[PDB]
Every structure is written in structure tokens, then in C-alpha cells.
Ligand binder design. Structure first.
Ligand SMILES: O=C(O)[C@H]1C[C@@H](O)[C@@H](O)[C@@H]([C@H](O)CO)O1
Lengths: 84, 58
């Protein structure tokens, strides 16, 4: 009902040094993995690339990914980081 | 040819007509403001945008 986890990575573009992670939310569900695992993954991606010290710099973005009539079965939430 | 031994009469016909066609048209006359998603290596911009309108009942 109000339990979700497992926020993973979805994009790592060296051009502009942008890392994007995504996580899922069911219809009547919430999601906040740990507020720190996303930072760790972003830092790992930046280190893998030529940058480092990822910064959140933004706010979560939620766009529906599954449509069932006038509803939203699943919602995708994105976290952006700017490697520096 | 004393009888109708040589009397002859014959007719034959063969008519064929085939046709085919297909059409496909589409038009779009809107204006939408989009946001850049990422900057490519050559400088091209990946743009994504969305607009939701609820006039009434939908
Ligand atoms: O010269 C013949 O061979 C003929 C003349 C015709 O009459 C022909 O039709 C046939 C007849 O079938 C005899 O019965 O005979």
C-alpha cells in the first residue's frame, strides 16, 4: 500500500554528464527507496564515467507508463544527477 | 456439301478485368511546447513534451 523500493539506473550520458535513475509505483502505492542508494548509484555511474561527485540538483519526475482506460496502473519516477 | 456436313457455326469469348487501389492520408495542425531531454554528441537536442486537456467528461 505504502511500501516500495528498488530504484535502479536508466541512463548515463557523458555528454553534459547526466545520470538518470528510474523507479516504479503501483496505482495505489508510494515509493522512496532509501534517499541514499540513489546517490550511491549516481556516484558509481559518475566514477565509471570521467566525472564524479554526483549531485541530485533536481526533483523527482513521475510519468505514467501503463494506461488502463481512465487510470494509471504504473507510474515511473525519475531522479536526475549532474556529475561534477 | 450436299447436307449440312460442312455447315459450321461457332462463337467464343473470354473477358477479364482486374482492379486495385489504396490510399492513406493524415494531417495534424497543432502547436505544442516541448522540453529538451538530452544533448547529443553533435549538438542535436532530444525533445519530449506532453500536454493534457480536460474539456469535460474525459
Ligand atoms: O452415302 C452415304 O454413305 C450416306 C448418305 C447419307 O444418307 C448419310 O447420312 C448416310 C446415312 O446414314 C445412311 O443411312 O448414308
Amino acid at each position: 500500500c505504502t511500501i516500495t523500493r528498488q530504484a535502479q539506473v536508466s541512463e548515463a550520458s557523458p555528454i553534459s554528464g547526466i545520470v538518470r535513475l528510474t523507479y516504479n509505483q503501483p496505482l495505489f502505492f508510494t515509493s522512496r527507496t532509501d534517499d541514499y542508494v540513489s546517490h550511491g548509484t549516481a556516484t558509481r555511474e559518475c566514477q565509471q564515467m570521467g566525472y564524479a561527485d554526483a549531485v541530485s540538483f533536481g526533483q523527482p519526475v513521475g510519468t505514467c507508463s501503463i494506461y488502463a482506460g481512465s487510470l494509471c496502473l504504473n507510474t515511473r519516477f525519475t531522479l536526475s544527477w549532474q556529475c561534477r | 456439301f450436299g447436307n449440312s456436313r460442312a455447315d459450321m457455326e461457332a462463337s467464343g469469348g473470354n473477358s477479364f478485368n482486374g482492379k486495385g487501389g489504396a490510399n492513406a492520408s493524415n494531417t495534424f495542425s497543432g502547436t505544442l511546447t516541448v522540453t529538451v531531454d538530452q544533448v547529443l554528441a553533435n549538438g542535436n537536442l532530444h525533445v519530449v513534451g506532453e500536454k493534457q486537456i480536460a474539456i469535460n467528461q474525459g
